[PDB]
């Protein structure tokens, strides 16, 4: 188990499994050649399931969301090591979006309506947009109805089709969904955008052989291939450590969220 021949690699189900797998094929092939190991991918049904599988010691690498990383780290022997870098920044934002047909173009128009969030353990499709709504005196179950639709693509689709009047999701995913034709830009209005949060961490099992750990980190750092990272509109990977996610811990405290 310190130097396995094949690596079990989990990817966050932030969108449909097909989409996540397809976007990662380039990276998988690169890493298999760089490391001379076979990679075997796993995409869970939901974020909590991925956390559980990490906590049980089944994974060698895992591409977590920021919040789901913080949660896993409480009960898993894992460490973050890399994150996507774009135009020199290693952060991303959440959006609050509204249904255009219903004229949902401000926070005031959310009141008394349906707000879609993704997975309960989502940073950019739950915690962050919820915080943004709270700062605008909107409170779930008091002056709006919340629905958890389980993923970012599910949020965008729900808002675009008017099943939900507003929603919160990843800015990069929203962009990708528009660029790929999945979402019609004319059917949604951007209401607000969040402050920058740290990018998703790539993580590894901490009891992998120290030489292998370095090889893995170095492999990510060495990647110079805009084509491989094109699905993520990214330049390169940079380094990250556990402390970079303290901002997410702090937000989780602010909102008094109970994952236990
Ligand atoms: Mg493979
Ligand atoms: Mg699911």
Numbering used by the authors: 9 to 268
Give the text the authors published on this PDB structure.
Here we elucidate the molecular basis of high-affinity phosphite and hypophosphite acquisition by determining the ligand-binding affinity and structure of the PBPs of phosphite and hypophosphite ABC transporters from environmental microorganisms. The structures reveal that ligand specificity, measured here by thermophoresis, arises from a combination of steric considerations and the interaction between a ligand P-H hydrogen atom and an aromatic π system in the binding pocket.
Given this similarity, it was unsurprising that the three oxygen atoms and the phosphorus atom of the MPn bind in the same position as those of the phosphite, with the methyl group of the MPn pointing in the same direction as the R1 hydrogen of the phosphite, towards the capping tyrosine residue (Y208/Y206). This might suggest that a C-H…π interaction is present, however the relative geometry of the two partners is sub-optimal for this type of interaction. Thermal ellipsoids were calculated from the anisotropic B-factors for the three structures that were better than 1.5 Å resolution (Te_PtxB and Pm_PhnD with MPn and Pm_PhnD with phosphite).
